[PDB]
């Protein structure tokens, strides 16, 4: 009735996915094998797990998500891991020789190799599904298939269904921290082929995960376990409406042309809170106002792009748990109140409340403390264009020096893809350039 499905790519990406399905399975508490601890009573009023966990004729409830990546080592760990009763073989599609972070390889070269298997799996699930709203696709501009092969993936999947929503979680090159140097190539080559195949998607950067887990989670020494846990929470709440009763169970498609008013600049930030320790869970109270005012801390901004340097457009503060329409509401007045913040005035307010009544659940072994209320500030501003500009300037020079270009030209891409894709970020620079212009008079 209300389905979504997750797709996983790139090393960090399927790392995220593993964390996620660990999470949801924890949260509905269905045991890793595929059974719930106990029988399910027959009831109505709304869906349940049925969105994602797959009903069998018995205690076998597998996700509705798919793995695809050409670097097949790690995924085997899932193939080995505790959830080897959880998942399902045909759920698993991997490539042996990954891209080597040639975008053009797993996009072009090995792009040709596994696509059809992917699409068949997709047809099996969507055919298995009925009211699948949209598509959860995860990848990374690092684990190279996460850029290339995913690029073809949406490039064709969109042309397959279209009417489904594109739920885009991919990681963005951290501003000064990194993984490689061809990242310019991965990213921008992705981007010009990303945009028109993307509906909307958010940009998760890691350095924020570090700084904030270390200060706010009080973390001393983190890694992808903590990161994947954190994105696990954020996606855990970004879709609760289709999973749990909330006052305004807003929906993705609902989000689509309302958060991203124009068609073009359709990405965003997301600073979840309240992430604190057990020793800050106590020694604190964690007000709605604390999560709320705290929600707009630029230093809390969960992607390393200063909001205060940008002007907000929309903010879908979907809330978990014991939320009051009034209290949050006045907090939103407080958000109108913030002098430092500046909004795409031709969209004076574009707010859209989310009050889901389940407060958050915590993953044992985790660092986040337990609370009563969650916020997701999926918000869109002018600010985020800048780091892009760093990307196209860095890539600008490096590409000017023809660095690495032999690698890509060797695999079947043309140079005008490069300069033209730079025209692509040129245009989007005109977009964040223009939409931020205040309409005259």
């Amino acid at each position: 009735m209300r389905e979504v499905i997750s797709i996983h790519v790139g090393q960090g990406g399927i790392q995220v996915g593993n964390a996620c399905w660990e999470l949801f399975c924890l949260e509905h508490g269905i045991q890793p094998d595929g059974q719930m601890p106990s029988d399910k009573t027959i009831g109505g009023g709304d869906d349940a797990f049925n969105t994602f966990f797959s009903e069998t004729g018995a205690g076998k409830h597998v996700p509705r998500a798919v793995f695809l990546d050409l670097e097949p080592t790690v995924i085997d760990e899932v193939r080995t891991g505790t959830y080897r009763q959880l998942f399902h073989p045909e759920q698993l599609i991997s490539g042996k020789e990954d891209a080597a972070n040639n975008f053009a390889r797993g996009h072009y070269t090995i792009g040709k190799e596994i696509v059809d298997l992917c699409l068949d799996r997709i047809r099996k699930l969507a055919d298995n599904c009925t009211g699948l709203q949209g598509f959860l696709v995860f990848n990374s501009v690092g684990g190279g298939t996460g850029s290339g092969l995913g690029s073809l993936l949406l490039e064709r999947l969109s042309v397959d269904y279209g009417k489904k929503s594109k739920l885009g979680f991919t990681i963005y090159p951290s501003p000064q921290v990194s993984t490689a140097v061809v990242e310019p190539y991965n990213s921008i080559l992705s981007t010009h082929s990303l945009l028109e195949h993307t509906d909307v998607a958010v940009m998760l950067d890691n350095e924020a995960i570090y700084d904030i887990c270390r200060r706010n989670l009080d973390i001393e020494r983190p890694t992808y376990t903590n990161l994947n846990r954190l994105i696990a929470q954020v996606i855990s709440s970004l879709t609760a409406s289709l999973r749990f009763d909330g006052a305004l169970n807003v929906d993705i498609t609902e989000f689509q042309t309302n958060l991203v008013p124009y068609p073009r600049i359709h990405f965003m930030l997301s600073s979840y809170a309240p992430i604190i320790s057990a020793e800050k869970a106590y020694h604190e109270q964690l007000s709605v106002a604390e999560i709320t005012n705290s929600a707009f801390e630029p230093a809390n901004m969960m992607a390393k792009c200063d909001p205060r340097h940008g002007k907000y457009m929309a903010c879908s503060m979907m809330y978990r748990g014991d939320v009051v329409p009034k209290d949050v509401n006045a907090s939103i007045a407080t958000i109108k109140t913030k002098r430092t913040i500046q909004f795409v005035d031709w969209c004076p307010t574009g707010f859209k409340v989310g009050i889901n009544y389940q407060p958050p659940t915590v993953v044992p072994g985790g660092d986040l403390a337990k609370v009563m209320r969650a916020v997701c500030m999926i918000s869109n501003s002018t600010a985020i264009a800048e780091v892009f500009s760093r990307l196209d300037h860095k890539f600008d020079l490096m590409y000017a020096k023809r660095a690495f270009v032999h690698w890509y030209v060797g695999e079947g891409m043309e140079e005008g893809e490069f300069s033209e894709a730079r025209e692509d970020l040129a245009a989007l620079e005109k977009d964040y350039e223009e939409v931020g212009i205040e309409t005259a008079e």
Binding site: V74, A100, Q176, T179, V182, R221, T223, K401
Partner: protein, 429 residues
């Protein structure tokens, strides 16, 4: 499966790989006999991509023996783990190259290549999705290079998709173990700049310096040295051999290491390196090993990062840590000595981690960065070649092989061209 093979010639290199497979055996804990005696399937999980099970569980290498005289074949044939081998691969010579490289390249070069490339090819059919293969010789003579030149040409043509990561011994500037070195070397390097996919420099004097100063050892041999290098060359495939929260293969490496294909001569750093007392001076941190990583004294090659500039730099980490540290030291260092970091390569440092370090240690570090400091290396060797080629000193041993001198000019203005090429890339912004 991204499995790979090994091929070794070389007056030393034939010993080197002996130590190498020896080390890998330790990291797979399989008996010398060829059956596993370890404690995790993880050693067996990815075992194949170097090894090969046999009927009955004889576990075997994907190695290829090069030699022009069986002594080494007997030597390693006399080797512990020698029962872990396949008698098939003991492909050697009846003459020896005498290290006139033309001898080992035309004379005996053309003489015994065929049986090698055949059986090797049988190994090629034995490989499901061959990531590559590892060649080993030295870049100053012919005991390895004599034929290994022909190998790189032949297999390179025969497998234009496979990776050719080439380690061969570089003559140190000071000690000339032979005087025909500039000529063998230059003639080879002409080839290797064209045909080899990866190369990392193999000095002896660095290895001495490591053993004597930083190892604090007085008694140098080869075997320890090959321990020190097969440590690294053994580390390189770790992620490729074992899981890693941040993995990168040789394709991701080289493609993430080289701007232009002429730059696959790389320098190497591995650590930690202590004598026994040192641990009771110091302990292990990622920042610590980092503080060794950019050490010229671990810079195991004739090139100086202190004199040249890091065109590229990378870290190979095996262990269990927090990458939140790792990156942090990374960027920290990429600032701290920014000047030796080439400019327009943003984030010219790049990362990795293997969930397991090598055996015995808890954390692993490896550095195969690429400055351009090697220019003094080629400049030197080319210089000596220049002098005696003014003299034609020992041309008669040479032209007796029936080469031309114009080839010497070819590798000559060739190799100079490569040097100046590195000059402009170093001298640019």
């Amino acid at each position: 499966m991204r499995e790979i093979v090994h091929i070794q010639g070389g007056q030393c290199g034939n010993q080197i790989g002996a130590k190498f497979w020896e080390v890998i055996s330790d990291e797979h804990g399989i008996d010398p006999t060829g059956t596993y005696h370890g404690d995790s399937d993880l050693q067996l999980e990815r075992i194949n991509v170097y090894y090969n099970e046999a009927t009955g569980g004889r576990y075997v290498p994907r190695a290829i023996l090069m030699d022009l005289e069986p002594g080494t074949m007997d030597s390693v044939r006399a080797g512990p783990f020698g029962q872990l081998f396949r008698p098939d691969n003991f492909v050697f010579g009846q003459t020896g190259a005498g290290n006139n490289w033309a001898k080992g390249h035309y004379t005996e070069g053309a003489e015994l290549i065929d049986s090698v490339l055949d059986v090797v090819r049988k190994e090629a059919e034995g490989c499901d999705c061959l990531q590559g293969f590892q060649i080993t010789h030295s870049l100053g003579g012919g005991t390895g290079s004599g034929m290994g030149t022909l190998l790189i040409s032949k297999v390179r043509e025969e497998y234009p998709d496979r990776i050719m990561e080439t380690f061969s011994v570089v003559p140190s500037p000071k000690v000339s173990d032979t005087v025909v070195e500039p000529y063998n070397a230059t003639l080879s390097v002409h080839q290797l700049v064209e045909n080899a996919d990866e190369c990392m420099v193999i000095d002896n004097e660095a290895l001495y310096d490591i053993c004597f100063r930083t190892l604090k050892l007085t008694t140098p041999t080869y075997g320890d040295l090959n321990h020190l290098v097969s440590a690294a060359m053994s580390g390189v495939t770790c992620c490729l051999r074992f899981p890693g929260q941040l993995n990168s293969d040789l394709r991701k490496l080289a493609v993430n290491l080289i701007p232009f294909p002429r730059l696959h001569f790389f320098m190497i750093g591995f650590a930690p390196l202590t004598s026994r007392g040192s641990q009771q001076y110091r302990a292990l941190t990622v920042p610590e090993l980092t503080q060794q990583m950019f050490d010229a004294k671990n810079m195991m090659c004739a090139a100086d990062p202190r004199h040249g500039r890091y065109l590229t730099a990378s870290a190979l980490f095996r262990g269990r840590m927090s990458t939140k540290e790792v990156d942090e030291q990374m960027l920290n260092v990429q600032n701290k000595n920014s000047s030796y970091f080439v400019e327009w390569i943003p984030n010219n440092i790049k990362s990795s981690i293997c969930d397991i370090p090598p055996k015995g240690l808890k954390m692993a570090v490896t550095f195969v960065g690429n400055s351009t400091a090697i220019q003094e290396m080629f400049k030197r060797v080319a210089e000596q070649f220049t002098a005696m080629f003014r003299r034609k000193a020992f041309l008669h041993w040479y032209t007796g092989e029936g080469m031309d001198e114009m080839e010497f000019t070819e590798a000559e203005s060739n190799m100079n061209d490569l040097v100046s090429e590195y000059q402009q890339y170093q001298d640019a912004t």
